[PDB]
Structure formats: C-alpha cells, structure tokens
Amino acid sequence: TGSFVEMVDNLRGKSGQGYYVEMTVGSPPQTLNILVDTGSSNFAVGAAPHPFLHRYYQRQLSSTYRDLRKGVYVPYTQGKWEGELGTDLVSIPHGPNVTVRANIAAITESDKFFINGSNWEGILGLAYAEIARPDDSLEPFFDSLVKQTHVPNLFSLQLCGASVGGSMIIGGIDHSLYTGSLWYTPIRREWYYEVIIVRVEINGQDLKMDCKEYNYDKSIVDSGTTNLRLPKKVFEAAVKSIKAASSTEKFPDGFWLGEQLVCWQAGTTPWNIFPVISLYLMGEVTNQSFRITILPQQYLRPVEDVATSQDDCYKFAISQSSTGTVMGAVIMEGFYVVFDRARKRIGFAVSACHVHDEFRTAAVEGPFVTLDMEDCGYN
Ligand SMILES: CCCc1cc(=O)[nH]c(N)n1
C-alpha cells in the first residue's frame, strides 16, 4: 500500500530551533533527542554536562561502548564542537525496528551549538561521506544502517509548520504524507544534497538573473537550517520584488533583515498581499524542469510574543548567504521531500500538512521546457 504508521509523527521541535527524533544509545539504552540534519554528515551526542542540556550520554554506563581513541572537530555556520570518537549500538524507538553499531562523537567542548530550551542533546548527520569529520573515511549513520540492515537506501521527510512536528520515514515513502505527484531533481553530487535551480519567480514574475546566480557556489536541501537562505545578489532582488508585491503595507527596515517582528490582530494576517515564491529545479528528463511554490505562511515564521494574545507576530525567514542557496525548513515545510539516495535524486510533492489558507496552496508543477540547465551549476 504505502503506510509507515510507526514512523508517522516521530519528529518534534520548537520553532527556529530545529526538528529532532528520539534515539537511544548504549546498553542499557539511553533515550536522547537527536536533531535531524541533511546539511551535515556526523552523528554526535552530548557526553558531558552543559548549561543548556537536560540530559547527556553517559558512555561509561554503556556496556557496548567502544572508544576509537581519537578526536573529532566539526564546525558549522551556526556553532562548532569538538569531541571524542567511538562507537556504540544505536536505535530509533519510532523508526525501523533495528539496532545498529555506528559511529558517535561524544561532545566535550562546544560553542553556540546546544540551544537553550531546544530539548535535543545531539545531532544526526544524514548527508554524505565527502563532508564528514575528521574526513571522508568516517562512515555516516545512514550508510551504517544500510550496511548492517535490509532497509532501503532512502528516507523521506515531512516537516510541518504551526511546538512544531513532522515525520521522518526511514526506508520508504508514505502515501498519506503528500497529495498529487512526486517530482524528482537530481542530486548533482553526493556530498551535500546538492540540487540545481534554473529559474526563480515572485508571483510568477521572473527574477531574471543568469541562473548561475541561483547556485553560487552551491544550492542545498538542509533540514538543519531554518530559513530560505539566498546568495547576496539573489536575496537583494527577491526582497525588492517581495517589497513591491506587499507594498499596500509598509514594514520597518529591520523586518526585512530578520531583525524585527511584524504583528497583526489575531486572524487578520493579510497573507494575500504577500507574494508566492517559485523555485524551478532541474529535472530527470533532458531540457526539463519542475517548480515548487511556497506561500507567505512558509517564509513568515510565526513568533509567540510575551505581550498578549490578540496579536499574531511573525519574522521574515528569508536571509542572505555567502555559502550558496540553502533550501531550509521554510522550503521543506511546503513539501514532502524524498531523499532517494539509492537513485541519486530528491523528490518533491505538496505536503499534506502544510500551512496555507482557503485561496492558495503550496504547489509542485511540471514539466517545463528549460534549456542548457547544466550551465546553471558552479565550477
Ligand atoms: C545544531 C545545528 C547544526 C547546523 C548548523 C548549521 O549552521 N547548519 C546545519 N545544516 N546544521
């Protein structure tokens, strides 16, 4: 049929602080909440006390704990930690019914990494080898899982909006998590989950750049990132185009920088004045592409605020980047995304749980005749 009921709704989170899954490590197993991250490729867990950790990995208590007698250091855009390598038996209570020996980094030192009141104490790097620390020699979690178990080389994510929730379906595709068709873009290279963007529209108006601008110096699908991050030039034209489309209301300058909340009486958010955003992505067929479309409900992240109800408050969740395009949680929150590693591709369908209104919905449409798409990549 297509129903993975044990794995539906296995993710949780706070807004702006990421999506996490419940995992266990060791013997006897220790329950820990682990961040689901397609932008990195290292499994790592808090193994010591910290001001923002409620619990941590007590490796001396694990009878199956192995020491790799080695060190590991991982930097991110947000934060960095260093830890002691080693292995232990790992399992996901609301995942596939398996236990696997895998690589673990026990975090001893970390800087601006563990978030206050996040409720997660580690991270699952789901991206490929080519970017693992200390190097490509370290086999990542999902590669271990497929080695030691019969589970298909494939996971899907449904990240829902709004504490948030979602579904990581390991080893398959759940039919209840989308509507309409799955459209596939090729993973251009197995390191990040790198895709190619061939065109951008705001309310159907072409942003009109050379397409290389959209993929400078890469475009990636990153569950571990909150915002839709765009290259400086692309960001500045989108904001200009979005400012124009929303011009019946003016907002403070700081709002467009992510520095300031905008607010409306409850239920009166004027979604319809804000534009739709379309990203055309390279297809499987030659000279073909499809487009995904998100709503202001995806790129205006809601913020609870400290004064009263009676106002619904939001943050602009599109930000500037220097490392390329990052299709983070604001993009992924409109779609069921299928990381089809077995067939070097990434699937997009309309999410069955996405936030929208009566009059507009997130969309995934195709095909479109689009030429010289290979040219859009960086080299
Ligand atoms: C805990 C956050 C880890 C992280 C940080 C970051 O900057 N990017 C990604 N993909 N992941």
Coordinates of C-alpha atoms and ligand atoms in Angstrom, one line a residue:
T1 CA 0.0 0.0 0.0
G2 CA 2.3 2.8 1.3
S3 CA 1.7 3.3 5.1
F4 CA 4.5 3.5 7.6
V5 CA 2.4 4.1 10.7
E6 CA 5.1 3.5 13.3
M7 CA 7.2 6.4 11.8
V8 CA 4.4 9.0 11.2
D9 CA 4.7 12.0 13.5
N10 CA 8.1 10.9 15.1
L11 CA 9.6 14.4 14.9
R12 CA 9.1 17.3 17.3
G13 CA 10.6 20.8 17.8
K14 CA 10.4 24.4 18.9
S15 CA 10.1 26.9 16.1
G16 CA 13.5 28.2 14.9
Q17 CA 15.3 25.5 16.9
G18 CA 15.1 22.6 14.5
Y19 CA 13.4 19.2 14.2
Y20 CA 14.5 16.2 16.4
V21 CA 13.9 12.5 16.6
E22 CA 14.0 10.3 19.7
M23 CA 17.0 7.9 19.5
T24 CA 18.7 5.6 22.1
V25 CA 22.4 4.8 22.6
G26 CA 24.1 2.1 24.6
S27 CA 23.4 -0.9 26.8
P28 CA 21.2 -0.2 28.8
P29 CA 19.9 2.2 26.1
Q30 CA 19.8 5.9 27.0
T31 CA 16.9 8.0 25.5
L32 CA 18.2 11.1 23.8
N33 CA 16.6 13.6 21.3
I34 CA 18.7 14.0 18.2
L35 CA 18.5 16.8 15.6
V36 CA 17.7 15.6 12.1
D37 CA 20.2 17.3 9.7
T38 CA 20.6 16.8 6.0
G39 CA 23.2 19.7 5.9
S40 CA 25.8 17.7 7.8
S41 CA 27.1 14.1 7.9
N42 CA 28.2 13.5 11.5
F43 CA 26.4 11.7 14.3
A44 CA 27.3 13.4 17.5
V45 CA 25.9 13.5 21.1
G46 CA 26.4 15.5 24.3
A47 CA 28.6 13.3 26.5
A48 CA 29.1 15.8 29.4
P49 CA 27.2 18.4 31.4
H50 CA 26.3 21.8 29.8
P51 CA 24.1 24.8 30.9
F52 CA 21.6 24.0 28.2
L53 CA 21.5 20.2 28.4
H54 CA 18.8 18.4 30.5
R55 CA 20.5 15.0 29.8
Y56 CA 23.6 13.6 28.2
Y57 CA 25.4 10.4 27.0
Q58 CA 27.0 8.6 30.0
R59 CA 29.3 6.4 28.0
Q60 CA 30.8 4.6 31.0
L61 CA 27.3 3.2 31.7
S62 CA 27.2 1.6 28.3
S63 CA 28.5 -1.9 28.3
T64 CA 28.8 -1.9 24.5
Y65 CA 30.6 1.5 24.4
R66 CA 33.8 1.4 22.3
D67 CA 36.5 4.1 22.3
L68 CA 38.0 4.9 18.9
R69 CA 40.8 6.6 20.9
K70 CA 40.6 9.5 18.6
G71 CA 39.5 13.1 18.3
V72 CA 37.0 14.9 16.1
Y73 CA 36.2 18.6 15.4
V74 CA 33.2 19.8 13.4
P75 CA 32.5 23.5 12.5
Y76 CA 29.1 24.7 11.2
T77 CA 27.7 28.1 10.1
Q78 CA 25.9 28.1 13.4
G79 CA 28.3 26.9 16.1
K80 CA 31.0 24.3 16.5
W81 CA 32.0 21.4 18.8
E82 CA 34.9 19.1 19.4
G83 CA 34.6 15.6 20.8
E84 CA 36.0 12.1 21.3
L85 CA 35.2 9.5 18.6
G86 CA 33.9 6.0 19.4
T87 CA 31.1 3.5 18.6
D88 CA 28.0 2.1 20.4
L89 CA 24.7 0.4 19.5
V90 CA 22.1 2.8 18.2
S91 CA 18.3 2.6 17.7
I92 CA 15.2 4.7 16.9
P93 CA 12.2 3.7 19.0
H94 CA 9.8 5.2 16.4
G95 CA 11.8 4.3 13.4
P96 CA 12.6 0.9 11.7
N97 CA 12.7 -2.0 14.2
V98 CA 16.5 -2.3 14.2
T99 CA 19.7 -1.7 16.2
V100 CA 23.0 -0.9 14.6
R101 CA 26.6 -0.4 15.6
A102 CA 27.6 3.1 14.4
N103 CA 30.0 6.0 14.8
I104 CA 29.4 8.5 17.6
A105 CA 31.1 11.7 18.6
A106 CA 31.0 12.3 22.3
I107 CA 30.8 16.1 22.6
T108 CA 33.0 17.5 25.4
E109 CA 33.5 21.1 24.2
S110 CA 31.0 23.2 22.2
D111 CA 30.4 26.8 21.4
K112 CA 27.0 28.3 20.5
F113 CA 25.8 24.8 19.5
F114 CA 23.4 23.5 22.1
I115 CA 20.3 25.8 22.1
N116 CA 18.7 26.8 25.3
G117 CA 15.3 25.0 25.8
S118 CA 15.6 23.1 22.5
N119 CA 15.0 19.7 24.0
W120 CA 17.6 18.0 21.8
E121 CA 21.0 16.7 23.1
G122 CA 22.7 15.5 19.8
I123 CA 22.6 15.6 16.0
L124 CA 22.1 13.1 13.2
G125 CA 24.1 14.0 10.1
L126 CA 22.1 12.5 7.2
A127 CA 24.2 14.0 4.3
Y128 CA 27.1 12.0 2.6
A129 CA 30.7 11.0 3.3
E130 CA 32.6 13.6 1.3
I131 CA 31.9 16.0 4.1
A132 CA 32.3 14.0 7.3
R133 CA 34.8 15.0 10.0
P134 CA 37.6 14.4 10.5
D135 CA 37.3 13.1 6.9
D136 CA 35.5 11.0 4.2
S137 CA 36.9 7.8 6.0
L138 CA 34.2 8.1 8.7
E139 CA 31.1 6.1 7.7
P140 CA 27.9 8.1 8.5
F141 CA 24.9 6.8 10.3
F142 CA 22.6 6.1 7.3
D143 CA 25.5 4.3 5.5
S144 CA 26.0 2.1 8.5
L145 CA 22.2 1.4 8.7
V146 CA 22.1 0.3 5.1
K147 CA 25.3 -1.8 5.5
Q148 CA 24.0 -3.7 8.6
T149 CA 20.3 -3.8 7.9
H150 CA 18.0 -4.6 4.9
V151 CA 16.5 -1.1 5.0
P152 CA 16.2 0.6 1.5
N153 CA 18.7 3.4 0.8
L154 CA 16.1 6.1 1.1
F155 CA 14.5 8.4 3.8
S156 CA 11.7 10.9 3.4
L157 CA 10.9 14.0 5.5
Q158 CA 7.6 15.8 6.1
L159 CA 8.3 18.9 8.3
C160 CA 5.0 20.6 9.4
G161 CA 4.6 24.3 10.3
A162 CA 2.4 25.9 13.0
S163 CA 5.9 23.4 19.2
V164 CA 6.2 22.0 15.6
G165 CA 6.0 18.4 14.4
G166 CA 7.0 16.1 11.5
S167 CA 7.7 12.7 10.1
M168 CA 11.0 11.0 9.1
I169 CA 10.1 7.8 7.3
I170 CA 13.3 5.7 7.1
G171 CA 13.4 3.2 4.2
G172 CA 10.3 4.3 2.3
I173 CA 7.7 6.7 1.0
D174 CA 4.4 7.2 2.9
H175 CA 1.5 8.0 0.6
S176 CA -0.5 9.7 3.4
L177 CA 2.1 12.4 3.6
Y178 CA 1.5 14.0 0.2
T179 CA -1.1 14.9 -2.5
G180 CA -0.5 14.9 -6.2
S181 CA 2.7 13.8 -7.9
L182 CA 6.3 13.4 -6.8
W183 CA 8.8 15.3 -9.0
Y184 CA 12.4 14.5 -8.8
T185 CA 15.5 16.7 -9.2
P186 CA 19.0 15.1 -9.5
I187 CA 21.4 15.1 -6.6
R188 CA 24.2 16.8 -8.6
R189 CA 26.9 15.3 -6.3
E190 CA 26.9 13.1 -3.2
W191 CA 28.3 15.4 -0.5
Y192 CA 25.7 17.9 0.5
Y193 CA 22.3 17.1 -1.0
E194 CA 23.1 19.5 -3.8
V195 CA 20.4 20.4 -6.4
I196 CA 20.3 22.9 -9.3
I197 CA 17.9 25.9 -9.5
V198 CA 17.2 27.0 -13.1
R199 CA 14.7 29.9 -12.6
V200 CA 13.1 32.0 -9.8
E201 CA 9.7 33.8 -9.9
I202 CA 8.0 36.0 -7.3
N203 CA 4.2 35.9 -8.0
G204 CA 5.1 34.5 -11.5
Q205 CA 7.4 37.4 -12.3
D206 CA 10.9 36.1 -13.4
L207 CA 13.7 37.3 -11.1
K208 CA 15.6 37.5 -14.4
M209 CA 19.2 36.6 -13.3
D210 CA 21.7 34.5 -15.0
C211 CA 20.8 31.1 -13.5
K212 CA 24.3 30.6 -12.1
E213 CA 23.5 33.3 -9.6
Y214 CA 20.9 31.0 -8.0
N215 CA 23.6 28.2 -7.5
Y216 CA 26.6 30.2 -6.4
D217 CA 28.6 28.4 -5.1
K218 CA 26.1 25.6 -4.4
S219 CA 22.3 25.0 -3.7
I220 CA 21.5 22.5 -0.9
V221 CA 18.5 21.0 0.8
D222 CA 19.2 21.4 4.5
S223 CA 16.7 20.3 7.2
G224 CA 19.2 21.7 9.8
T225 CA 18.6 25.3 8.6
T226 CA 15.6 27.4 9.5
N227 CA 15.5 30.0 6.7
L228 CA 15.5 30.1 3.0
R229 CA 19.0 31.5 2.6
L230 CA 19.9 33.1 -0.7
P231 CA 23.1 34.5 -2.3
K232 CA 23.5 38.2 -1.7
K233 CA 22.5 39.3 -5.2
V234 CA 19.6 36.9 -5.4
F235 CA 18.5 37.9 -1.9
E236 CA 18.5 41.6 -2.7
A237 CA 16.3 41.2 -5.9
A238 CA 13.8 38.9 -4.1
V239 CA 13.4 41.3 -1.2
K240 CA 12.9 44.1 -3.7
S241 CA 10.3 42.1 -5.6
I242 CA 8.6 41.0 -2.4
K243 CA 8.6 44.5 -1.0
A244 CA 6.9 45.7 -4.2
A245 CA 4.2 42.9 -4.2
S246 CA 3.4 43.6 -0.5
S247 CA 3.5 47.4 -0.9
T248 CA -0.1 48.1 0.3
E249 CA 1.5 47.8 3.8
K250 CA 5.0 49.1 4.7
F251 CA 7.1 47.4 7.4
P252 CA 10.1 48.6 9.3
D253 CA 13.5 48.3 7.6
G254 CA 14.6 45.8 10.3
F255 CA 11.8 43.4 9.4
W256 CA 13.3 42.6 6.0
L257 CA 16.7 42.0 7.7
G258 CA 15.2 39.4 10.1
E259 CA 15.8 41.9 13.0
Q260 CA 12.2 42.8 13.8
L261 CA 8.7 41.3 14.3
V262 CA 5.7 42.4 12.4
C263 CA 2.3 41.8 14.1
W264 CA -1.5 41.8 13.3
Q265 CA -4.7 41.3 15.3
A266 CA -5.3 37.6 15.7
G267 CA -6.8 36.1 12.5
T268 CA -6.1 39.2 10.4
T269 CA -2.7 38.5 8.9
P270 CA -3.1 39.7 5.3
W271 CA -1.5 36.6 3.7
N272 CA -2.9 37.5 0.2
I273 CA -0.9 40.7 0.0
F274 CA 2.4 38.7 0.2
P275 CA 3.7 37.1 -2.9
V276 CA 4.2 33.4 -3.7
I277 CA 7.8 32.2 -4.4
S278 CA 8.6 29.7 -7.1
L279 CA 11.9 27.8 -7.5
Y280 CA 12.3 25.9 -10.7
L281 CA 14.6 22.8 -10.3
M282 CA 16.4 20.7 -12.9
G283 CA 14.5 17.6 -13.9
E284 CA 15.3 13.9 -14.7
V285 CA 14.4 14.4 -18.4
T286 CA 16.7 16.3 -20.7
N287 CA 15.9 20.1 -21.0
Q288 CA 13.1 19.6 -18.4
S289 CA 12.3 21.1 -15.1
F290 CA 9.5 21.4 -12.5
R291 CA 8.7 24.2 -10.0
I292 CA 7.9 24.3 -6.3
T293 CA 5.9 27.1 -4.8
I294 CA 5.7 28.2 -1.2
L295 CA 3.4 30.7 0.5
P296 CA 4.0 33.6 2.9
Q297 CA 2.8 31.0 5.5
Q298 CA 6.2 29.3 4.9
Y299 CA 8.5 32.3 4.8
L300 CA 6.8 34.3 7.5
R301 CA 7.8 32.3 10.6
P302 CA 5.3 32.8 13.5
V303 CA 6.6 34.1 16.8
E304 CA 4.9 33.9 20.1
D305 CA 5.3 37.2 21.9
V306 CA 5.4 38.0 25.5
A307 CA 2.8 40.8 25.5
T308 CA -0.5 39.2 25.0
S309 CA -2.5 37.0 22.6
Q310 CA -4.8 39.2 20.4
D311 CA -1.8 39.7 18.1
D312 CA -0.1 37.2 15.8
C313 CA 3.5 38.1 15.2
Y314 CA 6.0 37.0 12.5
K315 CA 9.6 37.0 11.5
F316 CA 10.8 37.3 7.9
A317 CA 12.6 33.9 7.4
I318 CA 14.4 34.7 4.2
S319 CA 18.0 35.7 4.8
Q320 CA 21.2 36.4 3.0
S321 CA 24.0 33.8 2.5
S322 CA 27.7 33.6 1.3
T323 CA 27.9 29.8 1.1
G324 CA 25.2 29.5 -1.5
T325 CA 21.5 28.7 -1.5
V326 CA 20.2 26.8 1.5
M327 CA 16.6 25.4 1.0
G328 CA 15.9 25.1 4.7
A329 CA 12.8 24.4 6.8
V330 CA 10.7 27.2 5.2
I331 CA 11.1 25.5 1.9
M332 CA 10.8 21.9 3.2
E333 CA 7.6 22.9 5.2
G334 CA 5.6 23.1 2.0
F335 CA 6.6 19.7 0.7
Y336 CA 7.1 16.0 1.3
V337 CA 10.8 15.6 0.4
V338 CA 12.2 12.2 -0.5
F339 CA 16.0 11.8 -0.3
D340 CA 16.2 8.9 -2.7
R341 CA 19.9 8.1 -2.2
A342 CA 19.6 4.8 -4.0
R343 CA 18.7 6.6 -7.2
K344 CA 20.8 9.8 -6.7
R345 CA 17.7 12.1 -6.6
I346 CA 15.4 14.2 -4.4
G347 CA 11.6 14.1 -4.7
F348 CA 9.1 17.0 -4.1
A349 CA 5.4 16.7 -3.6
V350 CA 2.9 19.1 -2.0
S351 CA 2.9 18.5 1.8
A352 CA -0.4 17.1 3.2
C353 CA 0.2 19.1 6.5
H354 CA 1.5 22.4 5.2
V355 CA 0.1 25.7 6.4
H356 CA -2.0 27.5 3.9
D357 CA -5.4 29.3 3.6
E358 CA -8.6 28.8 1.6
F359 CA -7.3 30.5 -1.5
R360 CA -3.7 29.4 -2.1
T361 CA -1.7 26.2 -1.6
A362 CA 1.9 25.2 -1.9
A363 CA 2.4 23.7 -5.4
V364 CA 4.6 21.3 -7.4
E365 CA 4.1 21.6 -11.2
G366 CA 5.8 20.3 -14.3
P367 CA 7.2 19.7 -16.8
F368 CA 8.7 22.9 -18.3
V369 CA 10.9 23.2 -21.3
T370 CA 14.2 24.7 -19.9
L371 CA 17.4 24.6 -21.9
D372 CA 21.1 24.5 -21.0
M373 CA 20.3 23.7 -17.4
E374 CA 23.8 22.2 -16.9
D375 CA 25.1 25.7 -17.4
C376 CA 23.4 26.8 -14.1
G377 CA 26.0 24.9 -12.0
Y378 CA 29.1 26.3 -10.4
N379 CA 32.6 25.1 -11.4
Ligands
LIG1 C1 22.7 22.1 15.6 C2 22.7 22.9 14.3 C3 23.7 22.3 13.3 C4 23.8 23.1 12.0 C5 24.2 24.3 11.9 C6 24.2 25.0 10.6 O1 24.6 26.1 10.5 N1 23.8 24.3 9.5 C7 23.3 23.0 9.6 N2 22.9 22.3 8.5 N3 23.3 22.4 10.7

